[PDB]
Amino acid sequence: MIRFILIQNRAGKTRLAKWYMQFDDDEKQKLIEEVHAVVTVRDAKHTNFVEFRNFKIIYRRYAGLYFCICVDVNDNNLAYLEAIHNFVEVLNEYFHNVCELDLVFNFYKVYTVVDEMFLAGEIRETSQTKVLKQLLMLQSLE
């Protein structure tokens, strides 16, 4: 199970936050601060996985952006390390040469992409082909 997906930058500004279990605001907040305190301090000599509370966090930096997926401990690391990646690849196709800004000024459609590829804590679509085909069929929508 995926517990949450974060996208926050080198300073910890969250720029996407899909949660997959019930949390309060006060919780969601502390959580976002913690995911920062942990991911931001790791220097690539380290590995892409960390014990995080009772779960773990897969994550890869892309420019100033940390893409974090929190998962159950028994979850397949490489699986979720590439999910993150092909999700980014879809974003870069939807937005063409995507960057932090697209994800801010367009935050509201970031979520429709995310939920196309992940829903209810599980992976949904993997096929960049179909997920793009759909994102482009919407958008033609009134």
Binding site: N9, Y62, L91, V98, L101
Partner: peptide, 9 residues
Amino acid sequence: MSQIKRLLS
């Protein structure tokens, strides 16, 4: 910190 850098390429 210049948030316009591409995430890929």
